[PDB]
Write a protein that binds this ligand. Structure first.
Ligand SMILES: *C(=O)Cc1ccc(-c2ccc(-c3ccc(CC(*)=O)cc3)s2)cc1
Ligand SMILES: *C(=O)Cc1ccc(-c2ccc(-c3ccc(CC(*)=O)cc3)s2)cc1
Ligand SMILES: *C(=O)Cc1ccc(-c2ccc(-c3ccc(CC(*)=O)cc3)s2)cc1
Ligand SMILES: *C(=O)Cc1ccc(-c2ccc(-c3ccc(CC(*)=O)cc3)s2)cc1
Ligand SMILES: *C(=O)Cc1ccc(-c2ccc(-c3ccc(CC(*)=O)cc3)s2)cc1
Ligand SMILES: *C(=O)Cc1ccc(-c2ccc(-c3ccc(CC(*)=O)cc3)s2)cc1
Ligand SMILES: *C(=O)Cc1ccc(-c2ccc(-c3ccc(CC(*)=O)cc3)s2)cc1
Ligand SMILES: *C(=O)Cc1ccc(-c2ccc(-c3ccc(CC(*)=O)cc3)s2)cc1
Ligand SMILES: *C(=O)Cc1ccc(-c2ccc(-c3ccc(CC(*)=O)cc3)s2)cc1
Ligand SMILES: *C(=O)Cc1ccc(-c2ccc(-c3ccc(CC(*)=O)cc3)s2)cc1
Ligand SMILES: *C(=O)Cc1ccc(-c2ccc(-c3ccc(CC(*)=O)cc3)s2)cc1
Ligand SMILES: *C(=O)Cc1ccc(-c2ccc(-c3ccc(CC(*)=O)cc3)s2)cc1
Ligand SMILES: *C(=O)Cc1ccc(-c2ccc(-c3ccc(CC(*)=O)cc3)s2)cc1
Ligand SMILES: *C(=O)Cc1ccc(-c2ccc(-c3ccc(CC(*)=O)cc3)s2)cc1
Ligand SMILES: *C(=O)Cc1ccc(-c2ccc(-c3ccc(CC(*)=O)cc3)s2)cc1
Ligand SMILES: *C(=O)Cc1ccc(-c2ccc(-c3ccc(CC(*)=O)cc3)s2)cc1
Ligand SMILES: *C(=O)Cc1ccc(-c2ccc(-c3ccc(CC(*)=O)cc3)s2)cc1
Ligand SMILES: *C(=O)Cc1ccc(-c2ccc(-c3ccc(CC(*)=O)cc3)s2)cc1
Ligand SMILES: *C(=O)Cc1ccc(-c2ccc(-c3ccc(CC(*)=O)cc3)s2)cc1
Ligand SMILES: *C(=O)Cc1ccc(-c2ccc(-c3ccc(CC(*)=O)cc3)s2)cc1
Ligand SMILES: *C(=O)Cc1ccc(-c2ccc(-c3ccc(CC(*)=O)cc3)s2)cc1
Ligand SMILES: *C(=O)Cc1ccc(-c2ccc(-c3ccc(CC(*)=O)cc3)s2)cc1
Ligand SMILES: *C(=O)Cc1ccc(-c2ccc(-c3ccc(CC(*)=O)cc3)s2)cc1
Ligand SMILES: *C(=O)Cc1ccc(-c2ccc(-c3ccc(CC(*)=O)cc3)s2)cc1
Ligand SMILES: *C(=O)Cc1ccc(-c2ccc(-c3ccc(CC(*)=O)cc3)s2)cc1
Ligand SMILES: *C(=O)Cc1ccc(-c2ccc(-c3ccc(CC(*)=O)cc3)s2)cc1
Ligand SMILES: *C(=O)Cc1ccc(-c2ccc(-c3ccc(CC(*)=O)cc3)s2)cc1
Lengths: 5, 5, 5, 5, 5, 5, 5, 5, 5, 5, 5, 5, 5, 5, 5, 5, 5, 5, 5, 5, 5, 5, 5, 5, 5, 5, 5, 5, 5, 5, 5, 5, 5, 5, 5, 5, 5, 5, 5, 5, 5, 5
């Protein structure tokens, strides 16, 4: 539950 | 979750 | 969740 | 959740 | 939730 | 979140 | 959130 | 939130 | 919130 | 998150 | 239920 | 997350 | 339920 | 439930 | 995560 | 999970 | 998991 | 549940 | 796991 | 559940 | 569950 | 017709 | 017709 | 028709 | 038609 | 439809 | 429809 | 659709 | 579809 | 449809 | 589809 | 469809 | 038609 | 599909 | 479809 | 499919 | 049609 | 399909 | 498929 | 059709 | 399909 | 398949 672009 | 399109 | 389109 | 279009 | 169009 | 199309 | 189209 | 079209 | 079109 | 198409 | 842009 | 197409 | 852009 | 871009 | 196509 | 498309 | 497409 | 690009 | 496509 | 690119 | 490129 | 966003 | 995003 | 993103 | 991303 | 995208 | 996008 | 572009 | 581009 | 993408 | 590009 | 991608 | 990514 | 490119 | 990719 | 490229 | 990635 | 890849 | 390249 | 990657 | 790869 | 390359 973590996407940092 | 983390969904990026 | 996190949804980005 | 978080929805971004 | 958070909806942004 | 759910996205239909 | 839900998005239909 | 829900968005229909 | 709901948005119909 | 789920994305349908 | 959080979207900050 | 799940993505259908 | 978190999207920060 | 986290997407930071 | 699962991706269908 | 983390889904990026 | 971590899915990147 | 982690993708950082 | 870690899936990269 | 970790992909860092 | 680890791919770093 | 079409839908944008 | 088409859908964008 | 088509879907983008 | 087609799907992109 | 014809899509010029 | 023809879409010029 | 038919685009005469 | 048919594009006359 | 014809897609010019 | 048929593209006359 | 013809896809020019 | 086709799917990209 | 048929591309006349 | 014909795909020009 | 048939590409006339 | 085809799938890319 | 014909794929030009 | 048939490519006329 | 084909699959790439 | 014919694949030109 | 048949490539006329
Ligand atoms: C009880 O109160 C303690 C406790 C511990 C953990 C949880 C969680 C439920 C779901 C979690 C989670 C969501 C997303 C992500 C990032 C993407 O996968 C990680 C973990 S933690 C609830 C209660
Ligand atoms: C009691 O407090 C223990 C507990 C732990 C976790 C949960 C959850 C229920 C649903 C969860 C969830 C929903 C969506 C997402 C977004 C993408 O995956 C993550 C986690 S955690 C309930 C009770
Ligand atoms: C009691 O307090 C334990 C508990 C823990 C979690 C929950 C949840 C119910 C629904 C949840 C949820 C909904 C949407 C999202 C957005 C994307 O996933 C995340 C989590 S948590 C209820 C009771
Ligand atoms: C009692 O207090 C425990 C508890 C915990 C959570 C809930 C929830 C019910 C609905 C929730 C929710 C709705 C929408 C969103 C937006 C996107 O997901 C998130 C969470 S939490 C009720 C009782
Ligand atoms: C009692 O107090 C425990 C409890 C907890 C949560 C709720 C909720 C009912 C509806 C909720 C909700 C509605 C809309 C949104 C917006 C997007 O999701 C979020 C949460 S919380 C009731 C009782
Ligand atoms: C009882 O009184 C304690 C309690 C705890 C939590 C809740 C909640 C219900 C819904 C919640 C929620 C809505 C939106 C978001 C952001 C987007 O998902 C997060 C949590 S908290 C009610 C009562
Ligand atoms: C009881 O009162 C304690 C408690 C704990 C947690 C909750 C929650 C329900 C839903 C939650 C949630 C919503 C959105 C997000 C971000 C996107 O997924 C995270 C968590 S917390 C309610 C009561
Ligand atoms: C009880 O009150 C303790 C407790 C612990 C955890 C939760 C949660 C439910 C859902 C959670 C969650 C939502 C989104 C994310 C980010 C994306 O996946 C992580 C965790 S925490 C509720 C109550
Ligand atoms: C009690 O607190 C122990 C516990 C631990 C974990 C959970 C979870 C339920 C759902 C989870 C989850 C949902 C979505 C994602 C996003 C991608 O995978 C990650 C994790 S954790 C509940 C209770
Ligand atoms: C109790 O607290 C022990 C425990 C440990 C782990 C879990 C989990 C349930 C679901 C998990 C998970 C979901 C999605 C992903 C994303 C990709 O894989 C990772 C992990 S952990 C529940 C209870
Ligand atoms: C109790 O705390 C011991 C324990 C240990 C591990 C787990 C897990 C459940 C699911 C796991 C997992 C899901 C997805 C991925 C992504 C790719 O593989 C990794 C690990 S760990 C539960 C309880
Ligand atoms: C109990 O509370 C202790 C405990 C220990 C470990 C876990 C985990 C469940 C799933 C985990 C996990 C998810 C993703 C990854 C990266 C990709 O595979 C590694 C581990 S840890 C829960 C509770
Ligand atoms: C109990 O709380 C101690 C404990 C120890 C280990 C775990 C794990 C479950 C899954 C793990 C894992 C996920 C991904 C990777 C990288 C790719 O394979 C390594 C390990 S650790 C949970 C609880
Ligand atoms: C029984 O199947 C009746 C039937 C047949 C075909 C259809 C169609 C719905 C949408 C179609 C379409 C839209 C756009 C394009 C390309 C753009 O011009 C091709 C086809 S055919 C509905 C009911
Ligand atoms: C039985 O299926 C009756 C029937 C057949 C076709 C349709 C259609 C609905 C929408 C159509 C369409 C819209 C746009 C385009 C491209 C733009 O000009 C092609 C087709 S056909 C409805 C009922
Ligand atoms: C029963 O299935 C007979 C039948 C056949 C085809 C259709 C069509 C639906 C949409 C069509 C279309 C619209 C536009 C264009 C070019 C763009 O302007 C091509 C095709 S044909 C309905 C019923
Ligand atoms: C029963 O299946 C008979 C039948 C055959 C074909 C169709 C069609 C649906 C959509 C068609 C189409 C639309 C546009 C174009 C070029 C673009 O403008 C080609 C084909 S044919 C319906 C019923
Ligand atoms: C029985 O199967 C009736 C039938 C046959 C065919 C279809 C179609 C729906 C959509 C079609 C289509 C759209 C676009 C294109 C390329 C763009 O022009 C080709 C075909 S055919 C529906 C019902
Ligand atoms: C029963 O299966 C008979 C049948 C055969 C073929 C079809 C078709 C559906 C879509 C078709 C198509 C649309 C566009 C193009 C070129 C692009 O514009 C080629 C083919 S044919 C339906 C029923
Ligand atoms: C029984 O199978 C009826 C039938 C036959 C064929 C189809 C089709 C649906 C979509 C088709 C298609 C779309 C695009 C293209 C290339 C682009 O023009 C080829 C075929 S055929 C539906 C029902
Ligand atoms: C029963 O299976 C008879 C049958 C045979 C073939 C088809 C077709 C579905 C899609 C077709 C197609 C569309 C476009 C093109 C070139 C591109 O525009 C070639 C083939 S044929 C349906 C039923
Ligand atoms: C029984 O099998 C009826 C039938 C036969 C064939 C099909 C097809 C669905 C999609 C097809 C297709 C699409 C694209 C291409 C290349 C691009 O033009 C070739 C074939 S045939 C459906 C039902
Ligand atoms: C029963 O199996 C009879 C039959 C035979 C062949 C087919 C076909 C499905 C798709 C076909 C196709 C589409 C496009 C092209 C060239 C590209 O445009 C070649 C073949 S034939 C369906 C039923
Ligand atoms: C019984 O098997 C009916 C049948 C026969 C053949 C098919 C096909 C589905 C897709 C096909 C195809 C697509 C593309 C290409 C190359 C590109 O043009 C060749 C074949 S044939 C479905 C049902
Ligand atoms: C029963 O098995 C009879 C039969 C035989 C062959 C087929 C075919 C499926 C796909 C075919 C094909 C499509 C395209 C091309 C050239 C490219 O455009 C060659 C072959 S034939 C279906 C049923
Ligand atoms: C019984 O077996 C019916 C049958 C026969 C053949 C097929 C086929 C599915 C896909 C085929 C194919 C696609 C591409 C190519 C080369 C490109 O043009 C050759 C064959 S044949 C399905 C059902
Ligand atoms: C029963 O087995 C009869 C039969 C025989 C052969 C086939 C075929 C499936 C795919 C074929 C094919 C497609 C394309 C090409 C050249 C490329 O475009 C050659 C062969 S034949 C199905 C059923």
């Amino acid at each position: 539950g973590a996407v940092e672009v």
